[PDB]
Amino acid sequence: PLRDSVKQALKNYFAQLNGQDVNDLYELVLAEVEQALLDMVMQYTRGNQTRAALMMGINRGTLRKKLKKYGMN
Amino acid sequence: PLRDSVKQALKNYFAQLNGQDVNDLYELVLAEVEQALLDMVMQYTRGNQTRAALMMGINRGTLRKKLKKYGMN
Numbered sequence: 245p246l247r248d249s250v251k252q253a254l255k256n257y258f259a260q261l262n263g264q265d266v267n268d269l270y271e272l273v274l275a276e277v278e279q280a281l282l283d284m285v286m287q288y289t290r291g292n293q294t295r296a297a298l299m300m301g302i303n304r305g306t307l308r309k310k311l312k313k314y315g316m317n
Numbered sequence: 318p319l320r321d322s323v324k325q326a327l328k329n330y331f332a333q334l335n336g337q338d339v340n341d342l343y344e345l346v347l348a349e350v351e352q353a354l355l356d357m358v359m360q361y362t363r364g365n366q367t368r369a370a371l372m373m374g375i376n377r378g379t380l381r382k383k384l385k386k387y388g389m390n
Contacts, residue, residue, distance in 0.1 A: 245349075246322065246346075247349050247353040249319065250349075250354060255357070267371060267373075269372050269373045270354070270373040270374050274350075276320050280319075280320035280324050280327070281346055284331075299338075299340065299342055
């Protein structure tokens, strides 16, 4: 289950903090997961953005903002 | 690397998609990830919501809205 995989990835990450602040953990995890998701849906859809946005349940405009945020368009 | 576990999880989910449509895939992945992250951060901060919001980079009420969504306060 994916949920157990992000818990383990986070256990190992907290094991590397030694008094090192982290003040961006939400965007850091979100950037990793959103890039993987956009990558996988665009590959399945062969780059069709309307199809990809319908499958994800987001606006095609939103899809393209995210594609550009991560430099994937 | 977490993003590979996300890709393997999506690769297996699309293999289950034989003619069935999907229309909420972003919500499915986010819900699964935000729950594992809110659980791991609250344990690390020993339940302190202000230290958890600062580590995450979000403000306290955003963090509270999300805890409620997943029944965690």
